[PDB]
């Protein structure tokens, strides 16, 4: 309940700060190359978590590292019919996580979706476009739910007419 322009302006700046990444071979297993933010074996390689928030419900969590970033997001869910449609939408977005290369197949606890960005994505993909996908997501998700709430309500009328019309 603040405004949308500064929120995405803060998140966009923190992301550029946290996508300063490089390759890093492991120091606990012989020749592994993992994202240290997920395994969390080496505390020194884990930067601080930082949070951003318009309000209590909406917020973002950037857990950075030397070779990984984790961007958990919480979306606003005013009513129950919006909690449902957001829960399904992420499931159908996680199911195609091999195509969203920066995506986690499950979300962080307390959040609705979570991204994961390794040092191989910045080398291959355009670092500044990945940010624009996270930001484009955060401002379109509210529109793509109400468009479904309106689509459920429109369906419920036809299902009523097609029953009462026959009387």
């Amino acid at each position: 309940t603040a405004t949308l322009r500064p929120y995405l302006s803060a998140v966009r700046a923190t992301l550029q700060a946290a996508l300063c990444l490089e390759n890093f071979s492991s120091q606990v297993v012989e020749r592994h190359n993992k994202p240290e933010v997920e395994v969390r074996s080496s505390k020194e390689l884990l930067l601080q978590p930082v949070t951003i928030s318009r309000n209590e419900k909406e917020k973002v969590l950037i857990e950075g590292s030397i070779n990984s970033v984790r961007v958990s997001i919480a979306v606003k869910q005013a009513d129950e019919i919006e909690k449902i449609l957001c829960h399904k939408f992420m499931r159908f977005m996680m199911m195609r996580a091999e195509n969203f290369f920066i995506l986690r197949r499950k979300p962080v606890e307390g959040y609705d979706i979570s991204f994961l960005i390794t040092n191989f994505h910045t080398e291959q993909m355009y670092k500044h476009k990945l940010v624009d996908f996270v930001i484009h997501f955060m401002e379109e998700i509210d529109k793509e739910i109400s468009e479904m709430k309106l689509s459920v309500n429109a369906r419920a009328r036809i299902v009523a007419e097609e029953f009462l019309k026959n009387f």
């Binding site: 939408f89 484009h136 019309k165 009387f167």
Partner: protein, 282 residues
């Protein structure tokens, strides 16, 4: 398929196979089939005593004591007539169709065999629909337990017939969508002006039934149907009953099928986002 069919496929499919084989002169083939329908129904088609010329369509409704009352034992007889015989064991009703003594024009007895569940429910409506036409008020309501955790209360008055469903939504994702579907049945008289009035009390029952040992809960739902005499008259009571005994299943059919509409639409929006990411792929 928006509207549910009232006549079972397996009966119309099975009998017409026998009836078309015998009337073609071919020999009869045996049969032993158990199956089901909505509302806890259980059918059984069989050759009684091994006689492959006779087929016996039985059915095992629970709550049939509630239907033997209201005079359903007479309603079913006025339709099938000779075909109705003593009940098979464990089953409440039993027809019998003789393959060597078939009449021509078999599509009528077949189509009436599929409607056996309908012809059983059709008594409690025809009784109360007549009370309004006769002006009889003060009679007792009809409590029918069409499922173990649900109930159907009927009642008649001077100008209307009131039909109630004490349905139940297992999941909490269903009771949320259910409020949406029922909140539009209430406004259904905006398009269809002749249509019946509908109401919806989420947890608690209405005032007509609070005395009647009704159930309350965060998942139950009480759904009313006000039927005026342009529905309950002789020319429309058949098509009215053909819809009212399928409402509980019509509602849940479209809650489960609305999820598929949602799923169908999120697989697309997910592919719209995925075009934005591939901008990052060189």
């Amino acid at each position: 398929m928006i509207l549910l069919e009232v006549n079972n496929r397996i009966i119309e499919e099975t009998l017409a196979l026998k009836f078309e084989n015998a009337a073609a002169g071919n020999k009869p083939e045996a049969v032993e089939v158990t199956f089901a329908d909505f509302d806890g129904v259980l059918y059984h088609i069989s050759n009684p005593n091994g006689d492959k010329t006779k087929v016996m369509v039985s059915i095992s409704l629970k709550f049939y004591k509630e239907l033997q009352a209201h005079g359903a034992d007479e309603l079913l007889k006025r339709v099938y007539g000779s075909f109705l015989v003593n009940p098979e064991s464990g089953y409440n009703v039993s027809l019998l169709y003789d393959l060597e003594n078939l009449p021509a024009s078999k599509d009528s007895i077949v189509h009436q065999a599929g409607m056996l569940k309908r012809n059983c429910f059709a008594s409690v409506f025809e009784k109360y629909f007549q009370f309004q036409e006769e002006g009889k008020e003060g009679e007792n309501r009809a409590v029918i337990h069409y499922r173990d955790d649900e109930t159907m209360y009927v009642e008649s008055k001077k100008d209307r017939v009131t039909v109630v469903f004490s349905t139940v939504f297992k999941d909490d994702d269903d009771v949320v969508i259910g409020k949406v579907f029922m909140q539009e049945f209430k406004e259904g008289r905006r398009a269809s002006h002749t249509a019946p009035q509908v109401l919806f009390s989420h947890r608690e029952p209405p005032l007509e039934l609070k005395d009647t040992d009704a159930a309350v809960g965060d998942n139950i739902g009480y759904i009313t149907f006000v039927l005026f005499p342009r529905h309950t008259n002789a020319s429309a009571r058949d098509n009215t009953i053909n819809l009212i005994h399928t409402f509980r299943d019509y509602l849940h059919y479209h809650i489960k099928c609305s999820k598929a509409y949602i799923h169908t639409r999120m697989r697309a929006k997910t592919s719209d986002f995925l075009k934005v990411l591939n901008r990052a792929r060189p």
